[PDB]
Amino acid sequence: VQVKEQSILELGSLLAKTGQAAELGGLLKYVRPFLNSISKAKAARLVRSLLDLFLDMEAATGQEVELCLECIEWAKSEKRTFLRQALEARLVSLYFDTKRYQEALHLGSQLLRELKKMDDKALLVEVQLLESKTYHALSNLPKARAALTSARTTANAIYCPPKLQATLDMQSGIIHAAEEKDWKTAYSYFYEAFEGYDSIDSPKAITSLKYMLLCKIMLNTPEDVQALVSGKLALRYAGRQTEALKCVAQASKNRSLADFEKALTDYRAELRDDPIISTHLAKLYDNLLEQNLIRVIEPFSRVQIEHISSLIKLSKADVERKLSQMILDKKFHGILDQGEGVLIIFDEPPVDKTYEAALETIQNMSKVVDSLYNKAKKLT
Amino acid sequence: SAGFDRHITIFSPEGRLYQVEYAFKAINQGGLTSVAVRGKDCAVIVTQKKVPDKLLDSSTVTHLFKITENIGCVMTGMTADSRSQVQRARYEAANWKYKYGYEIPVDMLCKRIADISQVYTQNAEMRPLGCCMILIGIDEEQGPQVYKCDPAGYYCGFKATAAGVKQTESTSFLEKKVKKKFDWTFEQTVETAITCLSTVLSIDFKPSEIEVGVVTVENPKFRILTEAEIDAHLVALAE
Amino acid sequence: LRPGRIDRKIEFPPPNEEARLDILKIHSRKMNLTRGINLRKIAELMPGASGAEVKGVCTEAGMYALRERRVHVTQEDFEMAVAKVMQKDSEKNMSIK
Amino acid sequence: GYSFSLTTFSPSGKLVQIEYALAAVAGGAPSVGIKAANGVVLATEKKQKSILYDERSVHKVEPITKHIGLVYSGMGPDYRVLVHRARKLAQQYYLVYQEPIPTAQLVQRVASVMQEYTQSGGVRPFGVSLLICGWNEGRPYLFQSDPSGAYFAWKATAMGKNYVNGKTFLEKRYNEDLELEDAIHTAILTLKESFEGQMTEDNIEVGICNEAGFRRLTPTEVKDYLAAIA
Amino acid sequence: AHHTDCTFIRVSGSELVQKFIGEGARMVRELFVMAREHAPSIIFMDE
Amino acid sequence: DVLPPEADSSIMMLTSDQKPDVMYADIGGMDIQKQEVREAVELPLTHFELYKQIGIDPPRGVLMYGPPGCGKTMLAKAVAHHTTAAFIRVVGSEFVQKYLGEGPRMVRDVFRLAKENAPAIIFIDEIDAIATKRFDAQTGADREVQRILLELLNQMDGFDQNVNVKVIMATNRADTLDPALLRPGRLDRKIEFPLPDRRQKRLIFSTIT
Amino acid sequence: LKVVSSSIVDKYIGESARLIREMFNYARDHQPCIIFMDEIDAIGGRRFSEGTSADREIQRTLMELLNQMDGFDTLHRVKMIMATNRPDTLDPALLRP
Amino acid sequence: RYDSRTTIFSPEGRLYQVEYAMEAIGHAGTCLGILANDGVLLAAERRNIHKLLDEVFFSEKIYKLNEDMACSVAGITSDANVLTNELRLIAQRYLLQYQEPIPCEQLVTALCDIKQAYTQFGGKRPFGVSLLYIGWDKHYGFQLYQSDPSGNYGGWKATCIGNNSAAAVSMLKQDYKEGEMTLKSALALAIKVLNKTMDVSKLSAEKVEIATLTRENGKTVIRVLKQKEVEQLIKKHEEEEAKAEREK
Ligand SMILES: Nc1ncnc2c1ncn2[C@@H]1O[C@H](COP(=O)(O)OP(=O)(O)OP(=O)(O)O)[C@@H](O)[C@H]1O
């Protein structure tokens, strides 16, 4: 029995790599009777390894959700609370990979009700973190902050394994980074997450490393990005991903949109994960507004071509629309200043007489309406 | 705190013993400093001897006292108190031969001397004794051993130790010297001890002022170095 | 304290469970309590409250909603506030006697 | 007038001098004791004030009997006096009953010694707190004797500076079905939380009381546990 | 004080008068004399 | 004719023209304490409407207690620098004269200044306002200090509700920490300042460097 | 400028810090001139430590001095050296670099 | 003023140090006893419960002193350990001299004379311990007793000493019935009194310690009820409260 368990682990590892996903799924169905024969407490950890082995094999989400549900039914038949709670937590993480619109939220909500009643706090903190990640995916930031805050408060009382503390710290960084009110605190959480991830979770550390570098570019201190990669702590994970952040920081220091664009074009893989850099390009088009002011000042100097579109930084004629988006709302405060040769950018719309009279005349005529009532009633 | 246990050996808010802490200060009231240095095969005690008036015998005024043939001590503190401790240490060392059939280990003399001091702190009707004792002896299977005891009853083994007014600075010089990896031979240990007093006091003392007592693996007996021998080391370190 | 100078010596007791509910209702008058809130349970959850503490539970609970940017107060918010207003002090090895 | 004597009652509550003694125990090097399923593990922070002090001289964890060991938080001179008396009472029991003293009984006898000092007079109470351990009766036993003379049993406990932080750490990580080796790791970790510096084989002294006896771990052994995490 | 129909005087203040450099009998003798001027009067003391 | 109003809190309102000059950004790493103190003190003045909408009556007094050097006063001065209110920090002892129960003189000035501009905020530190030469209980001595606690408690009660005179206290003293001062309605919010740990230290080190 | 403090403490304990600020402004007038806090403890009679009749007003002035020295009143490279062995107690916070 | 020495007597003939010690007993776990026809019982509140503390020691506030006697201690912990040993010593010393178990009143009078002596002699402080005695003797049958730090003692059908003693005494005086205690009824009275005196809600088994002394087959059989026995009594009290609901 014990010898079979180690043999099954050896067979499962082979099925995870050399073996087909269907063969690994067949082994899980085969070991369901074996799970009954072995002690339930040992069986639950064995199930975690088997599910992880299925994840190691080529992803088959239709089979993976079905196998997880079958395992949930076996746990329901055995009525083992620990296995069912853990199975739901793996399934919500599997749902997060498919980014289920509400299915990830639904399973988590059901598990939360059981877990708040249950004394297994460590499972509760993990599920709370999953809810914050899914709310961030759906763009509901306030609920995501609430799930993160609840996870932290439960975690503070209980002992935290290193992976849990690091995952909790990175999520604090993602929510703090998303708010955009403070990026300095977000960097501190990401570094704490990378420091925890070092050695214990090698794949996770690079993701925190990329985020802490992004924070430096976002904090308007691009020079530090190169220094952090140079540091011995970051040297182990240094790679193409580190280079992409370095070039983007250089582009922001150069204050050149073309340099930022070239970096975006060079590393497609790095571009997919983070869209905050796209917001930096929008600040950079606003950074070139001063050059547009000199281009708008070009009529005051020498107007050439358009002075609002073809002339600005030469480049594409699709530059127009960035100006149009600026013209709506606050901006240069000049409507289509392309024709003139002298430049007419100014706004003077607050004359007190128009506003004060318009308010008083409406208020004064209210006396006229009221006076009519007072006089008419006495008259008749 | 102050104004609480100032007049008695009783506990104070924050659990501080004022009368015993004042005793450590009285050792400094002596106005003299002592340094002791352990070595690969040697233990050296050095003290400053001040002859206040020419009409006083240099031989009579000694703060280096042999307790047993293989054990010697340097006493820093009030003179009367230091001598009383010396008689007790000699009696206990003698009893150890008398009741156990072997010579007192240096570690054991300290525990006995410290235990007498601790009882004075716990039970009233006794002044703690304003003196600190550093004991040097060679122990087979332990090498040369330097040990120190406090009025409170604290005892500890020290690679190098100091006591008196300049103890804090003296330990600081010793800390730099001890940090150096090289072990110290008899010449080096005599030199380190004399230099430690020299750097701390800046006296550049003549042979008469420094009193040096040394115990060695080759000669286990505690030996009080003669003035001529003391001068020979003092000239050599200057070079 | 002599009766001629002071005729009556009225005593104000710590609010009873019924009284705590009454004070809770008085201070929850303007709050937008969501349907399903149990004010009676909240009075039971805090025993021997100082009345001002019952007022405190409402103010802290409202702030939990304000930080969450919602005007809809919920049963959980009152329960969390009860804990925040409540204060507990203990020491160890001084448990002689 | 109260708080200056242990021979007089407080005019309401309790004698303050015993409480002041507890304050001295609180100002002590951290001591962590972890009872475990197969043994009791005791530990203390031994940091010399200067590099000169020898770490091989006076020892904080000291054996009292083959199966009984003691650790202390509080004034160091007072500990040696009770370490001797506790050892002697264990010997008197052996001569009278030809059996090693049971751990529970030794704690009661040691506590009576501590109470005598708290009695009226010039004598001042011991400023040390103790963590007796034993394997008597096939069951691991961990006990604490305070200066007052009260004795209590702890699954895990801490005394000295940051006792509260240690106790809260113990609440979070101490289970019950843990082997002594796992208990050794937890004991070292609690000291690390309150350790103002990098723990080294010399810095921490750890003593175990398994079903074989109380043996202070060798400096090399402490280093191996300090290494490889913990 | 809101539902009174009587003068309400609040004297929760401490001693700044009497024999200090301040004034004489202000806390008590003066407070009662003012209460005499308004016959229906209630005085609230908070110490 | 009537002259314009004369006199001002301390030297002048908001600690005169002497703004502390420590920005909230300069105080880096006290994130939880910064948010709580802001809600208790700065937010009621800036957005009273939000508090009225939930009808919660804004929390007023805040108690900040921590091991020394943990960043409570740098935050307290920072609140004065970032405040739009007449935040005369009014540490307990400064322009105050010899007096018995001098808690009224300080609070009375705050009410007038809060009315003149915006609800004023008081920080309790330099709490040696009393212990004056014209002071001493008849025989108890301690009673006179107790009299100060009572006088402060009477003023704190409920102060100008909407123009609340917010009171921030950072005294690590149990003697003035009576349950009555800790009662809700007096020190409504309590924030404890932890010794900078890892991450909080990294923030303090990065900002200073 | 000698800060004996006898002139600085006249009829108001609080005014002592304000008068020191006036002296600091006088010190600012000459960049070479250096403030010397000689005999800082020295005062009429004896320095008043915390006490029922008189508290440690001088200690409060020392804390006020620390605030004046850094930030609000530092210009002209004038050094307010506390070169005095007169004070019985030295503040640990003052000792900080 | 007239404090400090137990020896000084106040101008009103009052020994304040003895009075202070008697007041001090209040800061201690509740201990109560009921005489109970056909039995006797001692109930105590187990204060200072914590997850880490083992509670390996059998009992904690209940100590047997003889084959036919027992006591519950409320007071300074160290003083209690001193008194319990002396009470055990006096019991065996009487057996050695007369070969009969000590009559219960005598064991109480002897400790009380020792406690009384501490008050009359200058050097020592008055004992801070008060205790309740349960036992059976042939001369006067089942008895219950109380001792004070002053050294005064009394026999009570029911009494309480620690914590809210007055609340228990008021509840006991109304609920107790003379001659009708019937042990099981007395156990119920204790659980109900304990619920009122303890601020603890639900009176969990760990918080309560119950020791019952009965004479079975001519031999006293002092027994401390196990947690399971205590739990059933607690559930019965809770069920009785449920029966009281609506009717009340
Ligand atoms: N968040 C922070 N960022 C940067 N420096 C800080 C921060 N918090 C504290 N410091 C530094 O620590 C110093 C000590 O702060 P502060 O004196 O306000 O501490 P405190 O605990 O409030 O003590 P006190 O109440 O005595 O003023 C500050 O003056 C500043 O130099």
mmCIF file with all atom_site columns, N, CA, C and O in Angstrom, chain B residues 43-75:
data_model
loop_
_atom_site.group_PDB
_atom_site.id
_atom_site.type_symbol
_atom_site.label_atom_id
_atom_site.label_alt_id
_atom_site.label_comp_id
_atom_site.label_asym_id
_atom_site.label_entity_id
_atom_site.label_seq_id
_atom_site.pdbx_PDB_ins_code
_atom_site.Cartn_x
_atom_site.Cartn_y
_atom_site.Cartn_z
_atom_site.occupancy
_atom_site.B_iso_or_equiv
_atom_site.pdbx_formal_charge
_atom_site.auth_seq_id
_atom_site.auth_comp_id
_atom_site.auth_asym_id
_atom_site.auth_atom_id
_atom_site.pdbx_PDB_model_num
ATOM 1   N N  . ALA B 1 43 ? 49.015 33.608 31.084 1.00 0.00 ? 43 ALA B N  1
ATOM 2   C CA . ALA B 1 43 ? 47.979 34.542 31.574 1.00 0.00 ? 43 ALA B CA 1
ATOM 3   C C  . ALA B 1 43 ? 48.705 35.697 32.259 1.00 0.00 ? 43 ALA B C  1
ATOM 4   O O  . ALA B 1 43 ? 49.526 35.415 33.142 1.00 0.00 ? 43 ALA B O  1
ATOM 5   N N  . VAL B 1 44 ? 48.414 36.941 31.883 1.00 0.00 ? 44 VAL B N  1
ATOM 6   C CA . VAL B 1 44 ? 49.208 38.080 32.429 1.00 0.00 ? 44 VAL B CA 1
ATOM 7   C C  . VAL B 1 44 ? 48.295 39.078 33.125 1.00 0.00 ? 44 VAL B C  1
ATOM 8   O O  . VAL B 1 44 ? 47.254 39.413 32.552 1.00 0.00 ? 44 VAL B O  1
ATOM 9   N N  . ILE B 1 45 ? 48.687 39.525 34.315 1.00 0.00 ? 45 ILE B N  1
ATOM 10  C CA . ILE B 1 45 ? 47.908 40.545 35.067 1.00 0.00 ? 45 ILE B CA 1
ATOM 11  C C  . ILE B 1 45 ? 48.781 41.792 35.107 1.00 0.00 ? 45 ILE B C  1
ATOM 12  O O  . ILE B 1 45 ? 49.954 41.651 35.464 1.00 0.00 ? 45 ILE B O  1
ATOM 13  N N  . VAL B 1 46 ? 48.253 42.953 34.727 1.00 0.00 ? 46 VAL B N  1
ATOM 14  C CA . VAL B 1 46 ? 49.053 44.201 34.871 1.00 0.00 ? 46 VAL B CA 1
ATOM 15  C C  . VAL B 1 46 ? 48.200 45.241 35.605 1.00 0.00 ? 46 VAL B C  1
ATOM 16  O O  . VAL B 1 46 ? 46.983 45.268 35.383 1.00 0.00 ? 46 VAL B O  1
ATOM 17  N N  . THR B 1 47 ? 48.811 46.017 36.497 1.00 0.00 ? 47 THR B N  1
ATOM 18  C CA . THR B 1 47 ? 48.070 47.040 37.269 1.00 0.00 ? 47 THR B CA 1
ATOM 19  C C  . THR B 1 47 ? 48.961 48.267 37.406 1.00 0.00 ? 47 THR B C  1
ATOM 20  O O  . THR B 1 47 ? 50.180 48.108 37.282 1.00 0.00 ? 47 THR B O  1
ATOM 21  N N  . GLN B 1 48 ? 48.377 49.436 37.658 1.00 0.00 ? 48 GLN B N  1
ATOM 22  C CA . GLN B 1 48 ? 49.219 50.633 37.895 1.00 0.00 ? 48 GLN B CA 1
ATOM 23  C C  . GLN B 1 48 ? 49.402 50.797 39.405 1.00 0.00 ? 48 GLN B C  1
ATOM 24  O O  . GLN B 1 48 ? 48.392 50.828 40.117 1.00 0.00 ? 48 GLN B O  1
ATOM 25  N N  . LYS B 1 49 ? 50.651 50.858 39.866 1.00 0.00 ? 49 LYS B N  1
ATOM 26  C CA . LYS B 1 49 ? 50.927 51.048 41.310 1.00 0.00 ? 49 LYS B CA 1
ATOM 27  C C  . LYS B 1 49 ? 51.381 52.488 41.509 1.00 0.00 ? 49 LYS B C  1
ATOM 28  O O  . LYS B 1 49 ? 52.427 52.863 40.952 1.00 0.00 ? 49 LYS B O  1
ATOM 29  N N  . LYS B 1 50 ? 50.629 53.242 42.301 1.00 0.00 ? 50 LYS B N  1
ATOM 30  C CA . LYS B 1 50 ? 50.982 54.661 42.520 1.00 0.00 ? 50 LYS B CA 1
ATOM 31  C C  . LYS B 1 50 ? 51.560 54.773 43.925 1.00 0.00 ? 50 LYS B C  1
ATOM 32  O O  . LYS B 1 50 ? 50.850 54.419 44.878 1.00 0.00 ? 50 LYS B O  1
ATOM 33  N N  . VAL B 1 51 ? 52.802 55.234 44.036 1.00 0.00 ? 51 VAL B N  1
ATOM 34  C CA . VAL B 1 51 ? 53.397 55.454 45.380 1.00 0.00 ? 51 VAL B CA 1
ATOM 35  C C  . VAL B 1 51 ? 53.081 56.906 45.720 1.00 0.00 ? 51 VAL B C  1
ATOM 36  O O  . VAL B 1 51 ? 53.712 57.801 45.128 1.00 0.00 ? 51 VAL B O  1
ATOM 37  N N  . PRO B 1 52 ? 52.123 57.185 46.628 1.00 0.00 ? 52 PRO B N  1
ATOM 38  C CA . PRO B 1 52 ? 51.707 58.562 46.898 1.00 0.00 ? 52 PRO B CA 1
ATOM 39  C C  . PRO B 1 52 ? 52.845 59.396 47.494 1.00 0.00 ? 52 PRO B C  1
ATOM 40  O O  . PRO B 1 52 ? 53.018 60.525 47.083 1.00 0.00 ? 52 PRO B O  1
ATOM 41  N N  . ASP B 1 53 ? 53.593 58.812 48.430 1.00 0.00 ? 53 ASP B N  1
ATOM 42  C CA . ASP B 1 53 ? 54.683 59.556 49.107 1.00 0.00 ? 53 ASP B CA 1
ATOM 43  C C  . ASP B 1 53 ? 55.944 58.698 49.051 1.00 0.00 ? 53 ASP B C  1
ATOM 44  O O  . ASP B 1 53 ? 55.820 57.469 49.105 1.00 0.00 ? 53 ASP B O  1
ATOM 45  N N  . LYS B 1 54 ? 57.111 59.334 48.991 1.00 0.00 ? 54 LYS B N  1
ATOM 46  C CA . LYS B 1 54 ? 58.389 58.581 48.981 1.00 0.00 ? 54 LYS B CA 1
ATOM 47  C C  . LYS B 1 54 ? 58.476 57.783 50.282 1.00 0.00 ? 54 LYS B C  1
ATOM 48  O O  . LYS B 1 54 ? 59.029 56.670 50.246 1.00 0.00 ? 54 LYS B O  1
ATOM 49  N N  . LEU B 1 55 ? 57.957 58.336 51.382 1.00 0.00 ? 55 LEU B N  1
ATOM 50  C CA . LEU B 1 55 ? 58.060 57.664 52.699 1.00 0.00 ? 55 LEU B CA 1
ATOM 51  C C  . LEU B 1 55 ? 56.973 56.601 52.779 1.00 0.00 ? 55 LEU B C  1
ATOM 52  O O  . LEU B 1 55 ? 56.153 56.704 53.691 1.00 0.00 ? 55 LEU B O  1
ATOM 53  N N  . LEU B 1 56 ? 56.965 55.643 51.851 1.00 0.00 ? 56 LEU B N  1
ATOM 54  C CA . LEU B 1 56 ? 55.992 54.517 51.851 1.00 0.00 ? 56 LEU B CA 1
ATOM 55  C C  . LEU B 1 56 ? 56.702 53.350 51.163 1.00 0.00 ? 56 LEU B C  1
ATOM 56  O O  . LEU B 1 56 ? 57.372 53.607 50.152 1.00 0.00 ? 56 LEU B O  1
ATOM 57  N N  . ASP B 1 57 ? 56.564 52.121 51.659 1.00 0.00 ? 57 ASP B N  1
ATOM 58  C CA . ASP B 1 57 ? 57.363 51.019 51.061 1.00 0.00 ? 57 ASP B CA 1
ATOM 59  C C  . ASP B 1 57 ? 56.667 50.539 49.798 1.00 0.00 ? 57 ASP B C  1
ATOM 60  O O  . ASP B 1 57 ? 55.469 50.244 49.870 1.00 0.00 ? 57 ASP B O  1
ATOM 61  N N  . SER B 1 58 ? 57.402 50.461 48.689 1.00 0.00 ? 58 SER B N  1
ATOM 62  C CA . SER B 1 58 ? 56.820 49.987 47.408 1.00 0.00 ? 58 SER B CA 1
ATOM 63  C C  . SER B 1 58 ? 56.370 48.535 47.572 1.00 0.00 ? 58 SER B C  1
ATOM 64  O O  . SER B 1 58 ? 55.327 48.169 47.004 1.00 0.00 ? 58 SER B O  1
ATOM 65  N N  . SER B 1 59 ? 57.146 47.746 48.311 1.00 0.00 ? 59 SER B N  1
ATOM 66  C CA . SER B 1 59 ? 56.820 46.314 48.508 1.00 0.00 ? 59 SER B CA 1
ATOM 67  C C  . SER B 1 59 ? 55.479 46.163 49.226 1.00 0.00 ? 59 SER B C  1
ATOM 68  O O  . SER B 1 59 ? 54.704 45.282 48.823 1.00 0.00 ? 59 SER B O  1
ATOM 69  N N  . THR B 1 60 ? 55.224 46.977 50.251 1.00 0.00 ? 60 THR B N  1
ATOM 70  C CA . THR B 1 60 ? 53.975 46.842 51.043 1.00 0.00 ? 60 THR B CA 1
ATOM 71  C C  . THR B 1 60 ? 52.758 47.147 50.170 1.00 0.00 ? 60 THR B C  1
ATOM 72  O O  . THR B 1 60 ? 51.756 46.430 50.304 1.00 0.00 ? 60 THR B O  1
ATOM 73  N N  . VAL B 1 61 ? 52.843 48.157 49.303 1.00 0.00 ? 61 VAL B N  1
ATOM 74  C CA . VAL B 1 61 ? 51.653 48.550 48.492 1.00 0.00 ? 61 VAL B CA 1
ATOM 75  C C  . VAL B 1 61 ? 51.611 47.692 47.227 1.00 0.00 ? 61 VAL B C  1
ATOM 76  O O  . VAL B 1 61 ? 52.239 48.078 46.228 1.00 0.00 ? 61 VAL B O  1
ATOM 77  N N  . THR B 1 62 ? 50.919 46.554 47.286 1.00 0.00 ? 62 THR B N  1
ATOM 78  C CA . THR B 1 62 ? 50.775 45.675 46.102 1.00 0.00 ? 62 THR B CA 1
ATOM 79  C C  . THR B 1 62 ? 49.305 45.290 45.943 1.00 0.00 ? 62 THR B C  1
ATOM 80  O O  . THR B 1 62 ? 48.706 44.878 46.941 1.00 0.00 ? 62 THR B O  1
ATOM 81  N N  . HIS B 1 63 ? 48.747 45.435 44.744 1.00 0.00 ? 63 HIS B N  1
ATOM 82  C CA . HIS B 1 63 ? 47.351 44.990 44.492 1.00 0.00 ? 63 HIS B CA 1
ATOM 83  C C  . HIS B 1 63 ? 47.375 43.646 43.765 1.00 0.00 ? 63 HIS B C  1
ATOM 84  O O  . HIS B 1 63 ? 46.304 43.189 43.346 1.00 0.00 ? 63 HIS B O  1
ATOM 85  N N  . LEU B 1 64 ? 48.558 43.053 43.602 1.00 0.00 ? 64 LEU B N  1
ATOM 86  C CA . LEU B 1 64 ? 48.630 41.699 43.002 1.00 0.00 ? 64 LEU B CA 1
ATOM 87  C C  . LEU B 1 64 ? 48.827 40.719 44.156 1.00 0.00 ? 64 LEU B C  1
ATOM 88  O O  . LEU B 1 64 ? 49.847 40.841 44.850 1.00 0.00 ? 64 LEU B O  1
ATOM 89  N N  . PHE B 1 65 ? 47.899 39.781 44.349 1.00 0.00 ? 65 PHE B N  1
ATOM 90  C CA . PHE B 1 65 ? 47.985 38.863 45.509 1.00 0.00 ? 65 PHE B CA 1
ATOM 91  C C  . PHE B 1 65 ? 47.932 37.424 45.018 1.00 0.00 ? 65 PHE B C  1
ATOM 92  O O  . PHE B 1 65 ? 47.072 37.120 44.184 1.00 0.00 ? 65 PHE B O  1
ATOM 93  N N  . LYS B 1 66 ? 48.833 36.575 45.507 1.00 0.00 ? 66 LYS B N  1
ATOM 94  C CA . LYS B 1 66 ? 48.757 35.134 45.167 1.00 0.00 ? 66 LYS B CA 1
ATOM 95  C C  . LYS B 1 66 ? 47.717 34.542 46.113 1.00 0.00 ? 66 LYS B C  1
ATOM 96  O O  . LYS B 1 66 ? 47.727 34.951 47.283 1.00 0.00 ? 66 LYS B O  1
ATOM 97  N N  . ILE B 1 67 ? 46.802 33.715 45.603 1.00 0.00 ? 67 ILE B N  1
ATOM 98  C CA . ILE B 1 67 ? 45.755 33.073 46.448 1.00 0.00 ? 67 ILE B CA 1
ATOM 99  C C  . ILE B 1 67 ? 46.206 31.645 46.755 1.00 0.00 ? 67 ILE B C  1
ATOM 100 O O  . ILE B 1 67 ? 45.938 31.162 47.866 1.00 0.00 ? 67 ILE B O  1
ATOM 101 N N  . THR B 1 68 ? 46.876 31.005 45.802 1.00 0.00 ? 68 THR B N  1
ATOM 102 C CA . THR B 1 68 ? 47.344 29.604 45.944 1.00 0.00 ? 68 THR B CA 1
ATOM 103 C C  . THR B 1 68 ? 48.598 29.540 45.080 1.00 0.00 ? 68 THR B C  1
ATOM 104 O O  . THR B 1 68 ? 48.807 30.486 44.314 1.00 0.00 ? 68 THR B O  1
ATOM 105 N N  . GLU B 1 69 ? 49.387 28.473 45.153 1.00 0.00 ? 69 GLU B N  1
ATOM 106 C CA . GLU B 1 69 ? 50.660 28.494 44.393 1.00 0.00 ? 69 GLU B CA 1
ATOM 107 C C  . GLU B 1 69 ? 50.345 28.695 42.917 1.00 0.00 ? 69 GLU B C  1
ATOM 108 O O  . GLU B 1 69 ? 51.050 29.484 42.283 1.00 0.00 ? 69 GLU B O  1
ATOM 109 N N  . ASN B 1 70 ? 49.313 28.032 42.409 1.00 0.00 ? 70 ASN B N  1
ATOM 110 C CA . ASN B 1 70 ? 49.017 28.116 40.956 1.00 0.00 ? 70 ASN B CA 1
ATOM 111 C C  . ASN B 1 70 ? 47.986 29.214 40.660 1.00 0.00 ? 70 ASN B C  1
ATOM 112 O O  . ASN B 1 70 ? 47.659 29.383 39.478 1.00 0.00 ? 70 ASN B O  1
ATOM 113 N N  . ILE B 1 71 ? 47.489 29.926 41.675 1.00 0.00 ? 71 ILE B N  1
ATOM 114 C CA . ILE B 1 71 ? 46.398 30.920 41.433 1.00 0.00 ? 71 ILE B CA 1
ATOM 115 C C  . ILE B 1 71 ? 46.769 32.294 41.995 1.00 0.00 ? 71 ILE B C  1
ATOM 116 O O  . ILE B 1 71 ? 47.118 32.370 43.175 1.00 0.00 ? 71 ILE B O  1
ATOM 117 N N  . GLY B 1 72 ? 46.656 33.340 41.173 1.00 0.00 ? 72 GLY B N  1
ATOM 118 C CA . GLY B 1 72 ? 46.945 34.711 41.628 1.00 0.00 ? 72 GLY B CA 1
ATOM 119 C C  . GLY B 1 72 ? 45.854 35.653 41.174 1.00 0.00 ? 72 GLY B C  1
ATOM 120 O O  . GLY B 1 72 ? 45.201 35.339 40.167 1.00 0.00 ? 72 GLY B O  1
ATOM 121 N N  . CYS B 1 73 ? 45.653 36.761 41.889 1.00 0.00 ? 73 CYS B N  1
ATOM 122 C CA . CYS B 1 73 ? 44.527 37.660 41.550 1.00 0.00 ? 73 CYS B CA 1
ATOM 123 C C  . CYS B 1 73 ? 44.955 39.125 41.574 1.00 0.00 ? 73 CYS B C  1
ATOM 124 O O  . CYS B 1 73 ? 45.933 39.434 42.271 1.00 0.00 ? 73 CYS B O  1
ATOM 125 N N  . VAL B 1 74 ? 44.261 39.983 40.821 1.00 0.00 ? 74 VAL B N  1
ATOM 126 C CA . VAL B 1 74 ? 44.520 41.448 40.907 1.00 0.00 ? 74 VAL B CA 1
ATOM 127 C C  . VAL B 1 74 ? 43.264 42.059 41.520 1.00 0.00 ? 74 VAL B C  1
ATOM 128 O O  . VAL B 1 74 ? 42.156 41.715 41.071 1.00 0.00 ? 74 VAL B O  1
ATOM 129 N N  . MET B 1 75 ? 43.425 42.897 42.540 1.00 0.00 ? 75 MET B N  1
ATOM 130 C CA . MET B 1 75 ? 42.234 43.439 43.228 1.00 0.00 ? 75 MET B CA 1
ATOM 131 C C  . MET B 1 75 ? 42.078 44.906 42.865 1.00 0.00 ? 75 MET B C  1
ATOM 132 O O  . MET B 1 75 ? 43.015 45.676 43.128 1.00 0.00 ? 75 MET B O  1
#
